[PDB]
Amino acid sequence: ASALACSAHALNLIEKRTLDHEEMKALNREVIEYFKEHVNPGFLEYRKSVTAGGDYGAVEWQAGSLNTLVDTQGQEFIDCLGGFGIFNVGHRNPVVVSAVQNQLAKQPLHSQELLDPLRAMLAKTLAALTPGKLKYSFFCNSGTESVEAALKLAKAYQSPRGKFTFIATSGAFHGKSLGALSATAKSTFRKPFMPLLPGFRHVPFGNIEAMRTALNECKKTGDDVAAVILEPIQGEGGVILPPPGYLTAVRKLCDEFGALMILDEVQTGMGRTGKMFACEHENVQPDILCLAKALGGGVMPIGATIATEEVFSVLFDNPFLHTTTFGGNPLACAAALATINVLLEQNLPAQAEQKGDMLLDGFRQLAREYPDLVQEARGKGMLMAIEFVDNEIGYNFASEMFRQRVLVAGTLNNAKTIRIEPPLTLTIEQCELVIKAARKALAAMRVSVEEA
Amino acid sequence: SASALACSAHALNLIEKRTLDHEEMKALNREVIEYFKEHVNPGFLEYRKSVTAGGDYGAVEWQAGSLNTLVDTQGQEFIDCLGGFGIFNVGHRNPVVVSAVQNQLAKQPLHSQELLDPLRAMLAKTLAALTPGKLKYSFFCNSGTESVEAALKLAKAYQSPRGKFTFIATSGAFHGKSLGALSATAKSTFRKPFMPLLPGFRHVPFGNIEAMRTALNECKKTGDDVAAVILEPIQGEGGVILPPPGYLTAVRKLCDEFGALMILDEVQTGMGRTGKMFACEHENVQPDILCLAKALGGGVMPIGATIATEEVFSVLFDNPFLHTTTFGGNPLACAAALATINVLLEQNLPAQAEQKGDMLLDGFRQLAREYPDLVQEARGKGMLMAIEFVDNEIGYNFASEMFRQRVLVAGTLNNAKTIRIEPPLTLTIEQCELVIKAARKALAAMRVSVEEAL
Amino acid sequence: ASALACSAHALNLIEKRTLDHEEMKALNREVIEYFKEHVNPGFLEYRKSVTAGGDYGAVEWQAGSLNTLVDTQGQEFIDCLGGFGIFNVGHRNPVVVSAVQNQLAKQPLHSQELLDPLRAMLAKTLAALTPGKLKYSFFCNSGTESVEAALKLAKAYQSPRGKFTFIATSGAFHGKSLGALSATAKSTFRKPFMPLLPGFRHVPFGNIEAMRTALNECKKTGDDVAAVILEPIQGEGGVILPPPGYLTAVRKLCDEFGALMILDEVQTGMGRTGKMFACEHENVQPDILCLAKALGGGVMPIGATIATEEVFSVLFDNPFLHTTTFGGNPLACAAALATINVLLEQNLPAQAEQKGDMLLDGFRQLAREYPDLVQEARGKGMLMAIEFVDNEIGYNFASEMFRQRVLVAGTLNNAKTIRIEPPLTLTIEQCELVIKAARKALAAMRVSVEEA
Amino acid sequence: ASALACSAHALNLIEKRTLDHEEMKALNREVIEYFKEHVNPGFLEYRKSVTAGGDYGAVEWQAGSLNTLVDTQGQEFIDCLGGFGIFNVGHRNPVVVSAVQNQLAKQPLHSQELLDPLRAMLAKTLAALTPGKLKYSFFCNSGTESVEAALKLAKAYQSPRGKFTFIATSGAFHGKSLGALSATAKSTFRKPFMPLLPGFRHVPFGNIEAMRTALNECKKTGDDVAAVILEPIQGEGGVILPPPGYLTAVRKLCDEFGALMILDEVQTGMGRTGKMFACEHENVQPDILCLAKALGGGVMPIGATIATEEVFSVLFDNPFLHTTTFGGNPLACAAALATINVLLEQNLPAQAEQKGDMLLDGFRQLAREYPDLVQEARGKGMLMAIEFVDNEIGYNFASEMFRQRVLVAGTLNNAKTIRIEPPLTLTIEQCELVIKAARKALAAMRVSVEEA
Ligand SMILES: Cc1ncc(COP(=O)(O)O)c(C=O)c1O
Ligand SMILES: *Cc1c(COP(=O)(O)O)cnc(C)c1O
Ligand SMILES: *Cc1c(COP(=O)(O)O)cnc(C)c1O
Ligand SMILES: *Cc1c(COP(=O)(O)O)cnc(C)c1O
């Protein structure tokens, strides 16, 4: 089976707008087959553990509307998954698609030698969009690249000052590339890949005393902390909100020891929590801010690491100290610029507050009626989670919701949690449908427990 | 000055424009320079200065002109002998890659990552078919440095249960800038500010099987057994360093003998550039893990791919979330890659890279004979070439004199005396000639400038 | 002069029991010069900062009585330094010296091939002397070597169980060799020698909640703690007593997480705090116990690492995994066997309880009279300390006690603190002289303060 | 039996000069039982492996003459083991014994506060005994401690110069404490205790071009070599001699790269290879020289780390940066001073050369005659080794020599290799008797093999 042949077959497919029954039967077969053979058979077994019958093999085909996805069988799903935080402004958002299309006609990828205007524009726009002294931007292609950039900026800055240790928090997720993975907290994701970067240590999230104890003990032993890295709200941890004033406290702790504050808003950024950045809630200015996911408007891959001139200036004397081939390419920038405009124009941060208040109320309500299955519902803005009592119940919830054509999924660090992360553009009727389908799934699950 | 809203709307409107007033052009250029200084990196403005003449430093990128040319905001058109450091193998805005991407953008650009996505499966089947021997499984990411992190993690996951933790790379090597990849990357400049890096990384001189065998033997004796060796078939940012014929095969045998894994970083050498689809096909070395990026995205999308045997990729099956990526293998990028593979094969671009590379290098080596004055030597394999000069400053002047002639070149990350020549594989034969003529005129100018300077 | 001439001159001096006034002048001259030129000019600077006038030049010549040292000028000192904790049964304790001579008559060092009986005899005595399941002994030559053996036993036991992290406490001193140094906590002793062993972390001494957090956080990130190591009371730290129930809580915490408990009793051991081992105040059984200093009766150098058979067994398959050339030699063992015998016959640990109480009563009294100069006095048995308001006041105390012919000295991890650490054999008569000497010292100190 | 009872019993044994037959049988029975239950049962298994019948349980009792040992049964063994390099001047050497007794009469251990004279005298004597600029001494208690001190000297010196990597050689043995173990090279000794000190790498012994490549690649990547450590002759490796001029080429390579040279003469030191130090053969001055074993005259444990003023001065500003409690105690200084005297007075390095050649000639003839059992014989001075065709043949040799009351034992990195390391004071008749015994042993071995 020649490689030309495979590529020609794929090009032929990419060009099909719609599939009929026999085309769908064949594409679904090839995709399951090739997943087993060339991608990961484990992912097939995973889908089985959160669906019922043939739903494991559901193959994603196209955007339906701003907030829906369609599989190869025409089945349309309401998206409460959001690509795990990617689709803040909806699927194929017309303003974003348009911007990308326009730039695609001029030049999608830059030479990396001439001065590329959209890099300059997005960095200007980001400077203005961010708190206080956050002034300089480095663009890359993902969240983990955003965090590697942050760790490196911290390292270049703190190294000549004698500081090499990094503090993160348990529950934290910061990416799976090996530097970012040193900060990431989940044991099962870390252990096979040890030894990781030396001098990374963890303290309980939300616990200012434990953090202070770590910075102070490190000082005593001559292992002074370079930087503290944390999410404002833990995402893959299961949507964990810290106590009030904790972020402000972590900011003061860091100034006190002369440590840098790195804030990872790859997941909480771009309006999802009810404000453009989750740090704007306590009005805290980190030294380095990590952005990705939704920054590309659900159309492009992109990441950005924004810092103070003070810190970022370590990159000035030699601008090749940290580089990236694709980072800040014109297509990625056009997507990011469109997304920032859409967010502001349509006041989507404010909408996420409003829609999130509604949905979490409906979720807390269902939690009360079904403590039979549901432990608790947490959230802020359109970042929410339902924590069930067992692992198996949460898997059954995902399964039942799937049958009702609502797409949800779990959390990387938390086995008992299903997330709810819809596009911020989710319509008021669609929020009603989601609570509706949530109830029905809970009811069906209850009935299954009595059934078994 | 403005709010983010006003800034985004200004950029959004500039994005829609196709051409520029003279006063619109002048305005934009002053913006780009100003914001590069205030919000990107003023040091980059300075680097552009040291490799240009006059306000050349502030040439601002506006659009692709043809397959092999770029146009700035002033309508100046440049023959691209930089190729985005190995990105534009099939040219700028190649119609088959643009079309595939545009068609997928109409369906779905990014996936949920939850449902099975069809193009991931197709690109994975296609790469299986494209790759030598037992390379069977593909992990998709967003960059070359991400590609190499995936390689290292795969090796780590496989070798740490077998009690092996040491990674051997080579000096001169460039494997990426993220902290995992940076640990294998070898340039002192790039490494020291971020130390300590990953433990267990050791380096031997490139292209020296004698030294590499000693390394692995010593590591075995002391109980610090070698998990994997990582190398580029040809060192790119190192200054286009060709290993002696026999090297890669010897590396394969050695890895076989000690039970080390062999990682080939073909992020720059891959997708046709050296005269084959992959530079390892030259000696027919099958690696345990193959890294791709740069040109795999067709010059339209960012993509990286890590391909490995089922034996090694295995480690990811029981828990498929052991290594993941949010954007990796998205439909837009998969389309761009499948398009690219098709074009490379249809238009037989690897074969073309061999013909055009022979001519171009033959041309440069002749010029080197003529100016021992300024040039040390010219080297290359297919369309991956470099010209080494006597001084960094002679080199910087070549880049500058070339830029004045509207031919784009640039240097290499681990060798300052070296100017890379990395044109699209689609560079026309006439353009090949033009580039040699441009290079000749530049060298003569340089000779005169050094004359008066002494 | 040749090496031979130097060896002969020094062999001549060793045979001399007493010095002419002229021989004395010349000896004190050569000793100061050779310290400068061949030992450490800096140790001469240190002594000056804690003596007055030419007192810095004092050169030690012989034991006087049990509790007494005599310099080269015939000047005699009551020893309240105890060699920083080695002279527990006094200077040249007759039973210990006798054991050592008798063994020297037979065989001072062993072959390491044939079975050396005194090693079997010492290992038997210590198994009988240690609480609970502590059963096997590895003999070495110092405290720091004793801690190295302990880290290795934990490493060899816990590495196959997937655990590599070590928790120690700030203020801790566990030795200066590079493995022990990784657990030793003073910044100033650690920085020039970094990178030390990886995987070592520090929590505050005496704070159990912080220790639970470190064990728990390590468990969460896959960095599971192999062992916890600590002194029951911190010596060099400044005689830092933990809360009641702390040591026991650490034992239960280790049990809970399946970490090994290492107890560093190099200073506290052999009767020093009022019991044979300080771990006996709460009846705590560590998995590994480290001994040295006083174990050699103030006559020989020796160390011992005692462990449960569960832990020590990691050395049975290949008894050559950890070894030492001089460890467990006949003279070291004779000395230790004599020391154990003397401590038990004369009920010396119990004496240390009584005399420590009485001595700490004198110092607490003086800290009452002189808040002028003194922060507080503390102690457990005969391991006591006086904390002063300043470093210099403490240095002044040390100099005044010296002028008063009572030998004291400072603590490695606390600059405001003067140890009082006399032989357990100190008479009540001398206890009262020591308390008078300290009052006179404070009297002169207060005066000199109000001169300025 | 109680701890007190155990100590009393041991003390009576220590007093008894002779043992009758059923005193022996009781003691022997004890020694084996206590080794089993409180020391290490594996030592019994190893000793069985290199003995025959009731030979495993040889229990040693006193020195016999200068060069012999007697066990509890009255069996006298000629000592070709030398305690693995300790007994350069024999067992209970009168001059060293007398120096020790005289010092025990005054002060066996010091306060560590007053200036102890014998530390100054030994440091002066060693300065005059050592090559060139080796001037300052740090005294400790073992070989592994003097390597520890050497690594720290280099670290303190090289850390501020930006260099942190250490190069050792495969085959090497430098001690078993975790710092020294990082440079020790046998896999068996290292693996279970990893992670060790970071930044330690190994190159093949005697191959200068391999060492240049490592030093050079390290520099390229920003991981510059702080220091190189090696033995002049590898001892535990199997008595591995380097090419002539290698040692000089390492000195020059270090000069060239600005790395420190550390020479480990813990085994080769104090006369054994024909000169006082094996570096004297090629006139090499290391920056740091390590000594132990024979430095203590076969009576005391001691170690020394001697360095140039350049290097050692990193300890002047803060003389407490590296310390050890027992290091340089009067008893150990007295034993070293006497050793230096005996070695020089009795011209014993010269004797080591003569007896070395004679013994090596003898083994070389036997190798020649029994190529069925013997691979080859190597050596320099009284450091020698016989390599056999396999392990078992080597073990049979050791066992046969033991039956003939000649004591030999293996090496820790090489299992086919038997070391021959007698006192430098071995008589010429004893030299001849060892060669005859080796012959009788080999003959019995060939015959043994014949039957099978
Ligand atoms: C608690 C403790 N551990 C370890 C040591 C190290 O003992 P040494 O100097 O004999 O190596 C000491 C010395 O102060 C000590 O007090
Ligand atoms: C999603 C996530 C990342 C992951 O980055 P990638 O784009 O998947 O490489 C990093 N940080 C946080 C907080 C995340 O939620
Ligand atoms: C460019 C390069 C990389 C890193 O690629 P990025 O996309 O810039 O992260 C890795 N390996 C090689 C050989 C490269 O040339
Ligand atoms: C024996 C040896 C050591 C270890 O000495 P110890 O006193 O047992 O700690 C160190 N270096 C060399 C060369 C040795 O032979």
What is the per-residue DSSP string for B375-426?
A: EEEEEEETTEEEEEESSHHHHHHHHHHHHHTTEE-EEETTEEEEEEE---TT
Burial environment of residue C112 by CB neighbours within 10 A (0 to 12, 13 to 18, 19 or more): buried
Q: Rounded to 5 degrees, what angle do the CA atoms D339, D340, D343 make?
A: 80
A314, A151 Cβ separation under 8 angstroms: no
D284, D131 Cβ separation under 8 angstroms: yes
Residue B105 CA to residue C173 CA, distance in Å, equals 64
B392, B57 Cβ separation under 8 angstroms: no
Task: Identify any residues that bridge with D264 across adjacent strands, giving them in sequence order.
Answer: D290
Residues of A in contact with B9 (CB under 8 A): 341
Across the interface, do B186 and D221 touch by the CB < 8 Å criterion? yes
Chains in contact with A via at least 3 Cβ–Cβ pairs below 8 Å: B, C
D349, D271 Cβ separation under 8 angstroms: yes
User: What atom of ligand 1 comes closest to residue C144's alpha carbon?
Assistant: 11
- Residue of A184, A293, A383 to mutate, ligand 2, most atoms within 8 A of C-beta: A293
Residue D356 CA to residue D381 CA, distance in Å, equals 4
Question: What is the DSSP secondary structure assignment for residue B133, as one 8-state letter?
Answer: T
Q: Would you state the torsion angle of the CA atoms of residues B265, B267, B270, B273, taken in this order, to the nearest 10 degrees?
A: -120
Return the amino acid letter for B16.
Answer: E
Distance B410 CA to ligand 4 centre (A): 56
Residue A341 CA to residue A324 CA, distance in Å, equals 26
Residue B290 CA to residue B288 CA, distance in Å, equals 7
Question: What is the DSSP secondary structure assignment for residue C265, as one 8-state letter?
Answer: -
B145 in contact with ligand 3, CB cutoff 6 A: yes
C120 CB contacts (<8 Å, ≥6 apart)? D30, D31, D34, D35, D38, D39
Residue B364 CA to residue B418 CA, distance in Å, equals 13
C196 CB contacts (<8 Å, ≥6 apart)? C178, C181, C182, C190, D197
* Residues found in chain B: 454
Whether chain C has a CB inside 8 Å of the CB on D10: the answer is yes
Buried b (16+ CB within 10 A) or exposed e, C278-287: bbbbbebbbb
C110, D83 Cβ separation under 8 angstroms: yes
| Orientation angle between helical segments C143-158 and D143-158, nearest 10 degrees | 90
Residue C295 CA to residue A390 CA, distance in Å, equals 56
Distance A429 CA to ligand 1 centre (A): 73
Of C314, C128, C125, which Cα lies nearest the Cα of D42? Answer: C314
Of C336, C303, C296, C301, which Cα lies nearest the Cα of C322? Answer: C303
Residue D372: which region, alpha, beta or left (left: phi > 0; alpha: psi -120 to 50)? alpha
Residue A220 CA to residue A11 CA, distance in Å, equals 62
A125 in contact with ligand 3, CB cutoff 6 A: no
Residue C167: which region, alpha, beta or left (left: phi > 0; alpha: psi -120 to 50)? beta
Return the amino acid letter for D19.
Answer: L
Cα dihedral sign for D1, D5, D7, D11? negative
Residue D311: which region, alpha, beta or left (left: phi > 0; alpha: psi -120 to 50)? alpha
Cα dihedral sign for C239, C136, D323, C34? positive
Of C340, C281, C273, which Cα lies nearest the Cα of C137? Answer: C340
C290, C151 Cβ separation under 8 angstroms: no
D386, D377 Cβ separation under 8 angstroms: yes
D274 CB contacts (<8 Å, ≥6 apart)? D281, D349, D350, D352, D353, D356, D380, D381
Distance from CA of B222 to the nearest CA of D (A): 4
Sheet holding D374-380, edge to edge: D374-380, D383-388, D417-420, D409-410
B240 in contact with ligand 3, CB cutoff 6 A: no
Buried b (16+ CB within 10 A) or exposed e, B367-379: bbeebeebbbebb
Q: Would you state the torsion angle of the CA atoms of residues D120, D126, D128, D133, taken in this order, to the nearest 10 degrees?
A: -100
Cis amide bond preceding A195, omega within 30: yes
C183 CB contacts (<8 Å, ≥6 apart)? C147, C151, C166, C168, C172, C174, C175, C200, C229
Chains in contact with B via at least 3 Cβ–Cβ pairs below 8 Å: A, D
Q: Which residue do the tokens 């014998």 mark? A: D118
Element (H, E) at D361: helix D348-369
Q: Which DSSP string do the residues of A281-312 spell out, in sequence order?
A: TTT---SEEEE-GGGGTTTS--EEEEEEHHHH
A320 in contact with ligand 3, CB cutoff 6 A: no
Distance B270 CA to ligand 3 centre (A): 11
| Backbone dihedral angles phi then psi of residue A131, each to the nearest 5 degrees | -50, 145
Q: Rounded to 5 degrees, what angle do the CA atoms B250, B254, B259 make?
A: 150
By Cβ distance, the residue of B191, B205, B220 closest to D222 is: B191
Question: What is the DSSP secondary structure assignment for residue D240, as one 8-state letter?
Answer: B
Under DSSP, is residue A243 helix (H, G, I), strand (E, B) or coil?
coil
Across the interface, do C142 and D326 touch by the CB < 8 Å criterion? yes
Return the amino acid letter for D24.
Answer: M
Residue A308 CA to residue A306 CA, distance in Å, equals 7
Element (H, E) at C406: strand C406-407
Residue A357 CA to residue A274 CA, distance in Å, equals 10
Element (H, E) at A139: strand A134-140
Burial environment of residue A375 by CB neighbours within 10 A (0 to 12, 13 to 18, 19 or more): middle
Label the pairing between strands D417-420 and D409-410: antiparallel
Residue C79 CA to residue C345 CA, distance in Å, equals 23
D257, D225 Cβ separation under 8 angstroms: yes
In C170-279, DSSP assigns E strands to: 200-203, 225-230, 260-264
Residue A408 CA to residue A397 CA, distance in Å, equals 9
Q: Ligand 4 pocket by C-beta < 6 Å: which residues?
A: C 324-326; D 142-144, 147, 173-175, 231, 235-236, 264, 266-267, 292
Residues of B in contact with D170 (CB under 8 A): 218, 221-222
Tokens of B284: 């027919």
Cis amide bond preceding C195, omega within 30: yes
B143 in contact with ligand 3, CB cutoff 6 A: yes
Under DSSP, is residue A67 helix (H, G, I), strand (E, B) or coil?
coil
Q: If you compute the radius of gyration of chain A from its CA atoms, what whole number of angstroms results?
A: 23
- Residue of C142, C266, C380, C419 to mutate, ligand 1, most atoms within 8 A of C-beta: C266
| Orientation angle between helical segments D3-15 and C94-106, nearest 10 degrees | 50
| Orientation angle between helical segments C94-106 and C330-345, nearest 10 degrees | 150
| Backbone dihedral angles phi then psi of residue A178, each to the nearest 5 degrees | -65, -25
Across the interface, do B8 and A193 touch by the CB < 8 Å criterion? no
Q: Which residue do the tokens 């036993």 mark? A: C153
CA dist list (Å): D178 to C147, D74, D116: 10, 40, 30
What's the distance, CA A443 to chain centroid?
Answer: 30
B209 CB contacts (<8 Å, ≥6 apart)? B246, B247, B250, B251, B254
Tokens of D2: 């109680």
| Closest chain A residue to C169, measured at CA | A217
Tokens of D440: 């009788």
Q: Rounded to 5 degrees, what angle do the CA atoms A392, A397, A399 make?
A: 90
By Cβ distance, the residue of A170, A218, A219 closest to C221 is: A170
Whether chain D has a CB inside 8 Å of the CB on C21: the answer is no
Note which residues in 390-449 of chain D have CB less than 8 A from chain C: 407, 409, 412
Of D388, D104, D71, A359, which Cα lies nearest the Cα of C93? Answer: D104
Burial environment of residue C128 by CB neighbours within 10 A (0 to 12, 13 to 18, 19 or more): middle
Buried b (16+ CB within 10 A) or exposed e, B266-282: bbbbbbbbbbbbbbbbb
Q: Rounded to 5 degrees, what angle do the CA atoms D199, D201, D205 make?
A: 155
Structural domains of chain B, with CATH:
1-93+348-454 (3.90.1150.10), 94-347 (3.40.640.10)
State the resolution, in angstroms: 2.3
Across the interface, do D99 and C145 touch by the CB < 8 Å criterion? no
How far apart are the two ends of chain A, measured CA to CA in Å? 48
B73 CB contacts (<8 Å, ≥6 apart)? A117, B20, B25, B28, B29, B60, B61, B62
D167 CB contacts (<8 Å, ≥6 apart)? D200, D201, D202, D203, D211, D214, D215, D218, D225, D227, D228, D229, D259
Under DSSP, is residue C69 helix (H, G, I), strand (E, B) or coil?
strand
Residue D106 CA to residue D330 CA, distance in Å, equals 9
A201 CB contacts (<8 Å, ≥6 apart)? A165, A166, A167, A168, A214, A218, C201, C217
Of A89, A106, A109, which Cα lies nearest the Cα of A97? Answer: A89
Buried b (16+ CB within 10 A) or exposed e, D20-40: eeeebeebbebbbebbebbbb
Whether chain B has a CB inside 8 Å of the CB on D212: the answer is no
